[PDB]
Amino acid sequence: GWVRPDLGELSKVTKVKTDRPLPENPYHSRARPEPNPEVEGDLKPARHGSRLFFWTM
Amino acid sequence: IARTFFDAPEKNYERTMAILQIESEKAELRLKELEVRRLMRAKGDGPWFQYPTIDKALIDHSPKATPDN
Incomplete structure (x- = not known):
């Protein structure tokens, strides 16, 4: 009493009733910088102009 | 002659004081500019000299065909 699956039935995505915890750090990384x-x-204006040599503005 | 043409000593005095104040502020800001630029290039923690790097939006987090990745 086993039914042969049709085309594409084995290629479906499934879900698994598992009990193992989700690994929070699977890549064994460290603390991020x-x-x-x-x-x-606010964007306050430049103090006393460009302040470049003798240019007041 | 002093009434018609010449500037008052009070006006020239306070004009000199204002000019001294403005140029002293500009000199202090220039010195702070040099020190801030030196520290920022030596440390790299500031918005200036932020050299580009690889964006992390290009990383694909989808499951691959091989489990070891």
């Missing part, structure tokens, strides 16, 4: 701080605050 801290990223650089972002930019915050």
Whole structure:
């Protein structure tokens, strides 16, 4: 009493009623480095112009 | 002659004070510019000198044909 599967029946994706825990760190990695701080605050204008040699503005 | 043409000593004095203040501020900001640039290039923790790297959006997290990956 075994039925031969048709075309594509064995190629379906399935689900498994397992009990093992999900590995939270499967790649055996380490702590990630801290990223650089972002930019915050309003865009205040440049103080006393470009401040390049004798150019006031 | 002093009434018609010449600037008052008070006006020239306070003008000199304002010019001194502005140029002193600009000099201090230039010195801070040099020190900040030196520290930022030596450390690399600032927004300046942020040299590009590989984006992590190109990593495919889908299951592959081989379990060892």
